[PDB]
Design a protein around this nucleic acid. Structure first.
Length: 76
DNA sequence: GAGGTTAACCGGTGGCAGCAGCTGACCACAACCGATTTTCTGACC
């Protein structure tokens, strides 16, 4: 999750917030994982980690909070 | 060589403002009348 989180430098927060959001995503994925998938755990959890990091970046991006749909159209 | 993955796109919810129709509060006014009260006039003769 450190190697996954390293691709989000310079976007609002420092690295540590991304690291801890990746830990949160790891907790959510390891709750939401099944052993009869026959899937690699990291390849499973990458979507969850990236989702958590991106939504926390959306939440804590700016001084004034902006809703995620306007964040999306700002990105667009 | 599609397997697995991936940003974005594409259904599918609950929140909210409108909003037109429905009260009743509340005023506009409008006369309108009602005691009061002067006070002038009006016959008694």
């Amino acid at each position: 999750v450190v190697s996954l989180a390293k691709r989000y430098t310079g976007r609002g927060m420092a690295f540590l917030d991304l690291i801890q959001e990746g830990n949160l995503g790891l907790i959510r994925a390891v709750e939401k994982f099944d052993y009869t998938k026959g899937y690699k755990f990291s390849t499973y959890a990458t979507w969850w980690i990236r989702q958590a990091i991106t939504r926390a970046m959306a939440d804590q991006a700016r001084t004034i909070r902006i809703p995620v749909h306007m964040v999306e159209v700002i990105n667009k």
